[PDB]
Amino acid sequence: VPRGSHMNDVLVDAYNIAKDSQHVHGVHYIRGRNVGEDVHLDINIYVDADLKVFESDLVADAIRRKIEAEVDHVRDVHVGVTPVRI
Amino acid sequence: SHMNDVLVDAYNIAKDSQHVHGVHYIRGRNVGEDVHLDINIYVDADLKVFESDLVADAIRRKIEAEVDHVRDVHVGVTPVRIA
Numbered sequence: 001v002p003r004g005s006h007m008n009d010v011l012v013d014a015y016n017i018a019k020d021s022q023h024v025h026g027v028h029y030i031r032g033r034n035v036g037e038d039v040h041l042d043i044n045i046y047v048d049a050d051l052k053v054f055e056s057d058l059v060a061d062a063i064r065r066k067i068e069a070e071v072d073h074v075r076d077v078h079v080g081v082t083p084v085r086i
Numbered sequence: 087s088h089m090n091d092v093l094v095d096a097y098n099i100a101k102d103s104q105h106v107h108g109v110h111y112i113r114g115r116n117v118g119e120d121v122h123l124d125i126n127i128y129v130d131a132d133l134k135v136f137e138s139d140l141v142a143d144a145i146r147r148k149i150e151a152e153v154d155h156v157r158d159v160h161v162g163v164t165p166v167r168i169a
């Protein structure tokens with residue numbers, strides 16, 4: 001039965017990294033699953049529908065790298081992308 | 087306030103409720119300026135369904151009552167079994 005000692009830390013720090021990043025029009029959803037004393041994180045961000053895929057790959061990747069690097073007790077991070085029409 | 091406020095307050099309500107052995111997961115979807123909240127709690131596998139309904143329901147009522155900017159709070163349950 002997973003110890004979620006850090007759910008609150010992780011969710012808040014991740015959300016703040018994501019919401020404020022380049023070309024993110026908002027966070028669609030965020031999910032935290034407890035795994036050991038660490039957290040499995042799924043985040044979905046809104047981006048412009050007209051953005052080209054290579055740049056949305058970079059946008060999502062930069063957020064994954066940054067969360068992984070900056071937020072403790074995160075065993076893994078998936079960053080999905082939902083197109084919005086602006 | 088939206089996501090961060092709501093997620094933390096809900097998690098703390100849920101995690102500390104009496105027949106909850108831990109929080110399995112928590113999900114927040116942004117809907118307007120409010121949050122759609124899905125939260126799954128670990129309970130004992132041998133708890134009878136009517137009581138786990140009450141446990142989950144009390145958490146839903148409490149979050150809804152105490153935590154602002156929350157649309158639909160769904161509280162699921164995953165059985166844990168020591169033995």
Ligand SMILES: [Zn+2]
Pocket residue numbers: 040041042078
């Ligand atoms: Zn995932």
Ligand SMILES: [Zn+2]
Pocket residue numbers: 122123124158160
């Ligand atoms: Zn739901």
Ligand SMILES: [Zn+2]
Pocket residue numbers: 119120155
């Ligand atoms: Zn509202």
